[PDB]
Amino acid sequence: KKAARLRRAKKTRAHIRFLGVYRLTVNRTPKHIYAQIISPNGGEVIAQASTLDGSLRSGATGNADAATSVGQLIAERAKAAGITKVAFDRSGFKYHGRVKALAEAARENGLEF
Amino acid sequence: MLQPKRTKFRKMHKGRNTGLAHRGSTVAFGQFGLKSLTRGRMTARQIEAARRTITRKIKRGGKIWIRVFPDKPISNKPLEVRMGKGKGPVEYWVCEIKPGKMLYELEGISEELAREALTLAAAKLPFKTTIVKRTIM
């Protein structure tokens, strides 16, 4: 349930807002996975990568490989946008499976968190 | 002898009685209304006596409404006791009264008989009273 998922994501969201660092928020669906970097103010999106990107749109989305790819592309985009230190936000999803692969790809491809 | 069945606190402060009776100045339940022009304290014994006189006069021909209830307790000290050493107990209960407050209302009876009964009740009560006709607005 999205209501419960947001209910269990708010603790991490609030702690990261208190920390005042750029936040790498993930949002995954049975079909697609999205990652975007929000500013410490929490209302600006400075980098994004999803499986809606033309590079991996016509492909096997909703997959661990797709999450790994999205992590690699958002890592490159953050490097090009000047972000090097973020706080990961699984957004209530368990740190596992597609979210975990996304995080590992981003962490190995330039971002350190 | 009107009295609350139970109270949260046995003793209550003396308080201060001031201001006009903005609430309870309009007659609702009954056609005939008796109001108080002067502020004061109304004892349960006073309420009982006025009720009894009004009931005797009506002789079961009209309906009586009591707008006053002695929720507030009053503490009195016994004789041959020095000041202090604790507050006294609630000998009797009184109802705070402000000018214009409704005391009693009557319905279902002739105006003249209601006026006579209200005169008797006013004679018993410690408040100056003027009979007031009920008004829609």
Binding site: - | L20, L37, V132
Partner: protein, 96 residues
Amino acid sequence: FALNAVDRSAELQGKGASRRLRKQNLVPAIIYGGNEEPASISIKINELVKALEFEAFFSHILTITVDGVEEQAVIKALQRHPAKGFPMHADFQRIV
């Protein structure tokens, strides 16, 4: 179902001015609703008392003549003295 009123100026408004007006034997009243802005008026207390005596006065269309302009209204609220009982304020609503 008609009554005569007088414009209540901004210097006749407020607590002290209202008490002075009632000492000059005028009852403050406000006509609002309808379409236009509220208008503040004063009604002679004897005339208002006599009008309040009649009972349909509280349920029919009233006509307020403010020394000139005319207003069809309906008495909405009446503030009386809690003890003395005399009228203290009047609230009328324009009828469209």
